[PDB]
Amino acid sequence: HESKQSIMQRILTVFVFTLLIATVGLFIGQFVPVALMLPLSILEVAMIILAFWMRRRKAVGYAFVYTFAFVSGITLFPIVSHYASIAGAYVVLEAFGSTFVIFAVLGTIGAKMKKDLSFLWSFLLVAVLALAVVGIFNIFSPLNSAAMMAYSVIGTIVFSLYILYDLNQIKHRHITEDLIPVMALSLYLDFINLFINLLRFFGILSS
Numbered sequence: 001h002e003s004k005q006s007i008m009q010r011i012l013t014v015f016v017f018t019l020l021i022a023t024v025g026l027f028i029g030q031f032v033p034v035a036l037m038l039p040l041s042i043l044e045v046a047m048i049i050l051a052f053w054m055r056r057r058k059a060v061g062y063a064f065v066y067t068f069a070f071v072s073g074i075t076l077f078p079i080v081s082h083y084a085s086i087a088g089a090y091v092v093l094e095a096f097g098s099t100f101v102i103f104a105v106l107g108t109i110g111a112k113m114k115k116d117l118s119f120l121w122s123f124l125l126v127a128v129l130a131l132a133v134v135g136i137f138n139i140f141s142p143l144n145s146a147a148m149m150a151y152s153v154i155g156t157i158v159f160s161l162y163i164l165y166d167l168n169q170i171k172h173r174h175i176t177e178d179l180i181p182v183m184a185l186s187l188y189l190d191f192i193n194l195f196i197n198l199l200r201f202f203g204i205l206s207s
Ligand SMILES: [Ca+2]
Pocket: 177
């Protein structure tokens, strides 16, 4: 018989694994020819849209989640290589480091706080959809550095709040063991989208 503790620890374990796998994918992605990479603007907004689309009460399997992490990791190399090329490779470390402790702190607080943050669900959905709209607009009408930085700050706030909210709902809601991959998948999409926002922000800022 599972407890709230074990289910949490299992979700977090799968989440850590999605990061490790994605990192392997990222490493592999450096070998993809330039002529076979998707446009930066397309890849960036794609992760936002997926973050929304994967957020369903549908039990997905470990196979999907782990394969998703591997393939998405590969496709995020053009994003990493771009902002590294305009601000130095060190900004990737900066972005990752900043994403890590934000997730670690906000994740812990959300998972430990007594307040039920369930009321944020609709607000957060609208916000992510709003980021998707701007992300799509960017494809056909490229925003400047100033606007893109403002976009990154909003995106940072939205996904930071989602991390707090997600860990909070894992504690408060009724999560069964068949929901473990989809809960971890959301945490993974939180991390990556927060990482992309910070990478873009600090990359543009140091350019
Ligand atoms: Ca069991």
